[PDB]
Amino acid sequence: TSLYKGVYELQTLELNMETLNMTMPLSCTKNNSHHYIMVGNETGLELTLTNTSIINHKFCNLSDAHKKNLYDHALMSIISTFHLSIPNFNQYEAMSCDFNGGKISVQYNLSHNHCGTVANGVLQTFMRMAWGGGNWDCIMTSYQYLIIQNTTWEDHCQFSRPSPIGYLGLLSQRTRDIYISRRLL
Amino acid sequence: TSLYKGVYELQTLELNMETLNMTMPLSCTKNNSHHYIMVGNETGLELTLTNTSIINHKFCNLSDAHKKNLYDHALMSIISTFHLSIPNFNQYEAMSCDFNGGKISVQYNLSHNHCGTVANGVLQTFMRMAWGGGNWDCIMTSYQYLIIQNTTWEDHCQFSRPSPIGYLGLLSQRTRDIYISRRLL
Amino acid sequence: TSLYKGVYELQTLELNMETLNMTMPLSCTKNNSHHYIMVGNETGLELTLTNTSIINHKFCNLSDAHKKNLYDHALMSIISTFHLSIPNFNQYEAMSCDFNGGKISVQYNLSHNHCGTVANGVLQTFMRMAWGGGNWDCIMTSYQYLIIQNTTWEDHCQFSRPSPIGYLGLLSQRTRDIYISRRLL
Amino acid sequence: GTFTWTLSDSEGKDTPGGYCLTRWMLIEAELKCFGNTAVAKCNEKHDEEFCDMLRLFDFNKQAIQRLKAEAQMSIQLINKAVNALINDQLIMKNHLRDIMGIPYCNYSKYWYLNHTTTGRTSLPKCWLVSNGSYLNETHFSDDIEQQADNMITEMLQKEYMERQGK
Amino acid sequence: GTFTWTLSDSEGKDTPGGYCLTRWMLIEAELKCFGNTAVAKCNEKHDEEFCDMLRLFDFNKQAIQRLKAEAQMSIQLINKAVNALINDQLIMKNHLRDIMGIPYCNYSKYWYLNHTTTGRTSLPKCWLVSNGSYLNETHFSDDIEQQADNMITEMLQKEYMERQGK
Amino acid sequence: GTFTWTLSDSEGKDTPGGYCLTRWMLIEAELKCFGNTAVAKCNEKHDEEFCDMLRLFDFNKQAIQRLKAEAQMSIQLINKAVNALINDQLIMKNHLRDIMGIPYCNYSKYWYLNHTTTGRTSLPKCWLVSNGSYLNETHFSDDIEQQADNMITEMLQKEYMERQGK
């Protein structure tokens, strides 16, 4: 109905990204706090911002998880990409995990210049990962925990459409801002 | 003899890439199972697919090898690139090594769904490195082991021409798909 | 005063890159031996080639420094980038550090083919980092130590203008030539 | 490096060397075929989000057709192909615009002009979002006008060169 | 990937869609504005050091204006934006030329031509350095002559196209 | 980023701004000089395998001439120059075509057209391989015809613009 130069009618299209599900992961946002990344039609990860922690120990037994080799390889790959993308992560106590039985549960304790804290790096990475919704690029929230757990497929994308863009963009961020912890990497 | 559009004869050329030997590694294939990457005209790496293992221990004393600093630095760099290019490597016992006296001996135990195995990841990296020769992109072979040993220069390139392409392409693959094994890298 | 084609005057401009101080680090050269990378108008790193060592122990307590979390995060990032950019670093005793109280002190011991030594890789990385003007690209100097310590602002750029180019270029070099020290990274 | 994936030949003969998006790939569940002119830009442009989404979709279809698809996912395949498929820096630029409060692209919606009489169209450009909502048409009408002008100038130049050759 | 940062609109109206370098960004403390022709090349070329410095400076300005600046630095911001702003391979090329003894660009100094009568200019190209000193003008005068030749050829071709349109 | 290596000036004066491959770089042990027109495409194209091999060979020669070559190799040098010399994504695309059963380039063999009378040629394109053998010439003759048609159109346009200038 909108006519430009008298001869050019303006038209739009919207891509149904959902059809990419078998060849790339799809991230979406349910609301401010809840976000999902689905891999195929059967499994995925739920990312929750929450005041209720679910892990009450200081362990993250990654090597035992690898040796047991019970987890889903795609989910562990995604988790690794997320963690390697965090900038300036230097408080290993802030991350606790549970992999018993092959499940994937990772919890970041965000409680405490506020910019140079684990909470900021974690939240920036989370913002990049779902890309769905302080000084310089600094982010702060009121949430005490970020929890990442495996989940089955369900139509979660109420606030934003599923998209692989965040994950693909984050792929290049891996190891970009990691610190050296020993002289021999 | 082959005229196109009446006035354009079709001609061809083939590059002798062996002349690049001093500035970049050259890979070639001997047969289905045996492939080589030579560095200059003096030394190189022989990669063999075989049922006959040559190492019968579970050690890989990389730190001690670095300490002694007797190996060829270029060959160790190539080994590092190869290992860092393997996707989703999570069975450290599957890789064994011997470096005494500066020698390089590396053995990947490929014995075992078949898509989600160390065998597949190792074989994809090897396939890229030499360019020779399952679900999705997954690869399986009948060999039980992949062995990497230093070797002297000899005219081995019977099946494929020497080429730097595999190594150069693999350079960008480094660390792209490695897992996290601790919270502080 | 320089006329080309009778109608085209040749004119020049020079950028004051110092004005970028707030958004990217700026490196400059004092003389052959001394080079600096400043971060903002308040802090930075002094890099010195010297015969006078300041550290006489073999420790580098990187993990304790991370745990204590007293250092400047930007300076630690720059140090991490520098170290991860060194090619083929394989003698961890050659690098010593002091981080007590949030200070940064790093000392590379360059004393000893001469090309395949820690001295060569560290010096190439340092040359790249400041870029202020052996066989192949190999570098050798008569200095026994490279010392990196934090410093406050002063007008240091007598020999070369401040520039961010070296740091930005080195960002892509990170981890490109690091050796594997274990099977499970 | 730079993207390299060549688009597969369009199924629809109306656009011989163009590309067609079938009913499954679009929300309006219709078929949209784009001509040679728009698709030729996708080989050389570096800032067209739409050409990166086209490469993604084409890779998806070809992978589904030539490889035996299974429900368990091969993250490795896309992990290796991603930089051959899309410019991750386009993504970074959209992120930077987002964090700076500048209107940005969510790769969801695209606008293009359609020359009713002939059926020729322009290369779709991303419909930007800002403050959580799509921009109103009046906010970027200048870009649409620019697109009409360029499609005019290029058509005139092609017609002139045609006249020249004859 | 490839650089993507779009230059912000020039403050000076003399160059409607061009770019202006203010007194602070230059050592001679004057204002130098470059026209649409030179700045449009910055969108498609990959080897123009000057277009990478323009993108860096524009990023700097935009960050200073849209983000709350503090003296403590956000290293992370530039770490993420770098490849969206500049081609690090340009840097690698200049480094390789340096270590091989070929004159190289150290991003300080640039030369360009000025058509006195009209004031239109060409895109500045780096003044190379070698052996610790700037090249003498006689050492690269051929490139300057070539640039003049390009400025001629292109202007005549645009004028022809103009003739074609009328 | 993007490749940046500028090709060194051709030794042969027959091609003033082109490039020459000496007898050592080819299996047929002869000298092949390509003109400035074909080699100029190598500065802007991103998908020409031949231009990436040219950059590799030129880097090899320049490194051998300006650096003191020794038998022990400086792998670091090529490790840092690689992305400045070639697009690794071209390699990734050829790998993806290989694993999908699509004909692919193994960088060994290249074909080009020769205008006998004048001696001008086109930019060589990789001779694809499939199922362990080179494709038969009849399988890709359409691409050769496309190359001839494009070379004709560009030639006609250059003479027209010449006529324009006079």
Ligand SMILES: *[C@@H]1O[C@H](CO[C@@H]2O[C@@H](C)[C@@H](O)[C@@H](O)[C@@H]2O)[C@@H](O[C@@H]2O[C@H](CO)[C@@H](O[C@@H]3O[C@H](CO[C@H]4O[C@H](CO)[C@@H](O)[C@H](O)[C@@H]4O)[C@@H](O)[C@H](O)[C@@H]3O)[C@H](O)[C@H]2NC(C)=O)[C@H](O)[C@H]1NC(C)=O
């Ligand atoms: C993450 O991993 C930790 C540590 O795992 C241990 O160490 C690694 C390196 C491997 O060797 C593992 O096999 C080890 O288990 C786990 O914590 C451990 O949990 C186990 C199982 O519950 C505990 O073992 C039991 O502990 C009780 C007695 O503990 C006391 O004595 C031991 C030995 O002296 C001592 O280490 C401990 O501190 C206590 O003093 C008892 O029920 C029983 O006999 C058994 O020994 C083990 O003690 C725990 N280790 C520590 C250091 O607390 C986490 O459970 C695991 N988490 C997940 C989610 O998997």
Ligand SMILES: *[C@@H]1O[C@H](CO[C@@H]2O[C@@H](C)[C@@H](O)[C@@H](O)[C@@H]2O)[C@@H](O[C@@H]2O[C@H](CO)[C@@H](O[C@@H]3O[C@H](CO[C@H]4O[C@H](CO)[C@@H](O)[C@H](O)[C@@H]4O)[C@@H](O)[C@H](O)[C@@H]3O)[C@H](O)[C@H]2NC(C)=O)[C@H](O)[C@H]1NC(C)=O
């Ligand atoms: C790779 O590295 C392993 C481990 O090396 C050890 O650990 C590293 C961290 C360093 O500290 C090394 O110096 C250590 O040796 C090597 O295995 C070791 O080989 C050495 C040399 O043959 C063995 O030392 C001998 O072992 C015999 C007795 O062993 C018994 O007693 C020791 C001590 O209590 C005990 O550790 C071992 O399990 C046995 O119970 C004997 O001939 C002699 O006295 C001497 O001690 C050493 O024992 C080995 N360590 C282990 C854990 O088995 C590998 O040889 C090396 N491989 C390669 C290919 O390089």
Ligand SMILES: *[C@@H]1O[C@H](CO)[C@@H](O[C@@H]2O[C@H](CO)[C@@H](O[C@@H]3O[C@H](CO)[C@@H](O)[C@H](O[C@H]4O[C@H](CO)[C@@H](O)[C@H](O)[C@@H]4O)[C@@H]3O)[C@H](O)[C@H]2NC(C)=O)[C@H](O)[C@H]1NC(C)=O
């Ligand atoms: C990029 O940003 C844009 C702009 O914000 C964003 O557009 C929004 O998308 C959401 C999600 O699709 C839209 O919300 C929908 O609106 C209505 C009313 O509620 C319903 O159709 C939807 O809910 C139904 O469908 C859901 C999915 O099946 C179910 O989960 C749910 O139970 C309902 O059945 C849904 O809420 C929203 O309207 C638009 N906004 C605008 C202005 O159009 C876009 O999604 C973003 N793209 C990406 C890839 O993130």
Ligand SMILES: *[C@@H]1O[C@H](CO)[C@@H](O[C@@H]2O[C@H](CO)[C@@H](O[C@@H]3O[C@H](CO)[C@@H](O)[C@H](O[C@H]4O[C@H](CO)[C@@H](O)[C@H](O)[C@@H]4O)[C@@H]3O)[C@H](O)[C@H]2NC(C)=O)[C@H](O)[C@H]1NC(C)=O
């Ligand atoms: C790209 O793909 C092509 C096509 O598949 C592939 O070409 C093959 O190259 C190999 C290696 O050059 C050729 O093998 C030769 O074959 C003949 C016939 O037996 C022999 O003359 C040759 O033996 C000579 O060379 C040996 C090694 O130097 C010596 O040991 C021996 O004494 C001889 O001097 C040699 O085996 C093969 O014929 C072609 N195949 C075809 C169809 O042309 C090419 O290698 C691939 N390139 C890359 C880089 O992978």
Ligand SMILES: *[C@@H]1O[C@H](CO)[C@@H](O[C@@H]2O[C@H](CO)[C@@H](O[C@@H]3O[C@H](CO)[C@@H](O)[C@H](O[C@H]4O[C@H](CO)[C@@H](O)[C@H](O)[C@@H]4O)[C@@H]3O)[C@H](O)[C@H]2NC(C)=O)[C@H](O)[C@H]1NC(C)=O
């Ligand atoms: C690119 O290469 C060029 C050419 O080599 C190089 O230019 C050089 O810059 C330095 C630093 O600005 C110049 O040295 C200056 O020379 C005079 C005489 O000493 C003085 O003006 C300067 O000293 C004063 O100013 C300094 C800066 O504020 C103070 O630190 C100092 O205390 C003095 O107050 C200074 O020494 C040198 O002359 C030029 N060379 C030429 C040939 O013009 C440029 O720096 C290189 N750029 C990069 C980014 O590497």
Ligand SMILES: *[C@@H]1O[C@H](CO)[C@@H](O[C@@H]2O[C@H](CO)[C@@H](O[C@@H]3O[C@H](CO)[C@@H](O)[C@H](O)[C@@H]3O)[C@H](O)[C@H]2NC(C)=O)[C@H](O)[C@H]1NC(C)=O
């Ligand atoms: C997430 O991090 C917060 C902040 O560190 C943790 O809360 C902290 O819990 C510790 C104990 O684990 C408290 O330390 C103790 O506090 C009192 C004195 O203040 C006393 O009992 C001991 O001497 C000891 O110091 C600490 O105060 C508390 N910090 C707070 C509440 O700000 C929290 O436990 C972490 N959550 C998880 C799930 O790990």
Ligand SMILES: *[C@@H]1O[C@H](CO)[C@@H](O[C@@H]2O[C@H](CO)[C@@H](O[C@@H]3O[C@H](CO)[C@@H](O)[C@H](O)[C@@H]3O)[C@H](O)[C@H]2NC(C)=O)[C@H](O)[C@H]1NC(C)=O
């Ligand atoms: C490895 O590659 C190197 C570099 O291409 C090869 O060295 C080069 O070998 C050629 C052929 O022998 C030499 O050319 C000849 O040199 C002299 C005059 O210099 C003379 O005999 C001939 O007229 C001819 O030009 C070339 O100089 C030489 N280059 C260097 C720097 O040594 C080498 O042959 C290759 N090795 C293998 C096993 O292929």
Ligand SMILES: *[C@@H]1O[C@H](CO)[C@@H](O[C@@H]2O[C@H](CO)[C@@H](O[C@@H]3O[C@H](CO)[C@@H](O)[C@H](O)[C@@H]3O)[C@H](O)[C@H]2NC(C)=O)[C@H](O)[C@H]1NC(C)=O
């Ligand atoms: C390469 O990997 C294979 C597979 O893991 C290794 O063979 C395995 O060898 C172990 C012992 O080292 C065998 O375990 C033992 O088996 C029997 C019961 O089955 C019994 O003796 C013990 O209780 C123990 O479980 C294991 O079965 C065997 N796996 C096979 C044959 O599939 C092989 O040793 C590796 N090669 C090298 C050179 O290390």
Ligand SMILES: *[C@@H]1O[C@H](CO)[C@@H](O[C@@H]2O[C@H](CO)[C@@H](O[C@@H]3O[C@H](CO)[C@@H](O)[C@H](O)[C@@H]3O)[C@H](O)[C@H]2NC(C)=O)[C@H](O)[C@H]1NC(C)=O
């Ligand atoms: C580091 O670079 C920054 C950014 O260029 C410099 O801050 C800027 O300094 C200039 C020159 O003093 C300021 O311009 C002046 O500002 C006021 C009006 O705003 C007035 O005095 C003048 O008319 C002139 O425009 C500029 O505002 C200031 N920018 C900010 C954001 O503070 C800084 O000086 C440089 N630091 C060093 C140590 O060189």
Ligand SMILES: *[C@@H]1O[C@H](CO)[C@@H](O[C@@H]2O[C@H](CO)[C@@H](O[C@@H]3O[C@H](CO)[C@@H](O)[C@H](O)[C@@H]3O)[C@H](O)[C@H]2NC(C)=O)[C@H](O)[C@H]1NC(C)=O
């Ligand atoms: C920087 O590295 C140099 C070279 O490694 C260090 O000098 C070395 O110091 C060690 C002792 O720490 C010397 O080893 C001892 O030497 C004599 C026999 O030569 C004897 O006392 C012992 O049996 C032992 O082998 C070593 O010779 C010496 N190397 C030299 C002088 O070239 C230097 O200490 C390091 N600097 C710092 C600050 O750590």
Ligand SMILES: *[C@@H]1O[C@H](CO[C@@H]2O[C@@H](C)[C@@H](O)[C@@H](O)[C@@H]2O)[C@@H](O[C@@H]2O[C@H](CO)[C@@H](O)[C@H](O)[C@H]2NC(C)=O)[C@H](O)[C@H]1NC(C)=O
């Ligand atoms: C989740 O809880 C926080 C408060 O966490 C408490 O304070 C921390 C410092 C630490 O001691 C925790 O253990 C405590 O549970 C809520 O933050 C409040 O937010 C409101 C609304 O913005 C604000 O007015 C209050 O001042 C905040 N309180 C504090 C102490 O900062 C936060 O809102 C909770 N999140 C949700 C979604 O309910």
Ligand SMILES: *[C@@H]1O[C@H](CO[C@@H]2O[C@@H](C)[C@@H](O)[C@@H](O)[C@@H]2O)[C@@H](O[C@@H]2O[C@H](CO)[C@@H](O)[C@H](O)[C@H]2NC(C)=O)[C@H](O)[C@H]1NC(C)=O
């Ligand atoms: C810094 O000192 C070196 C010499 O270091 C000594 O020798 C080493 C082998 C090792 O044992 C160190 O601990 C010693 O302190 C000086 O190198 C000399 O340089 C001159 C001039 O180039 C040369 O003629 C001498 O042969 C060198 N000496 C040696 C032993 O190699 C170097 O010059 C000193 N640098 C400065 C700035 O003072």
Ligand SMILES: *[C@@H]1O[C@H](CO)[C@@H](O)[C@H](O)[C@H]1NC(C)=O
């Ligand atoms: C490959 O060549 C080696 C070395 O001669 C030989 O031992 C082996 O049998 C060959 N392998 C195959 C699969 O033909």
Ligand SMILES: *[C@@H]1O[C@H](CO)[C@@H](O)[C@H](O)[C@H]1NC(C)=O
């Ligand atoms: C492997 O390297 C060692 C150390 O130089 C050497 O002695 C040995 O001969 C090499 N092995 C082979 C098979 O060439």
Ligand SMILES: *[C@@H]1O[C@H](CO)[C@@H](O)[C@H](O)[C@H]1NC(C)=O
């Ligand atoms: C370089 O400058 C430093 C700092 O002023 C000074 O101590 C040193 O003597 C200088 N070095 C040389 C070699 O001139």
Ligand SMILES: *[C@@H]1O[C@H](CO)[C@@H](O)[C@H](O)[C@H]1NC(C)=O
């Ligand atoms: C640095 O600049 C800030 C303003 O951005 C100012 O507060 C401070 O005094 C300056 N520091 C120095 C040492 O000049």
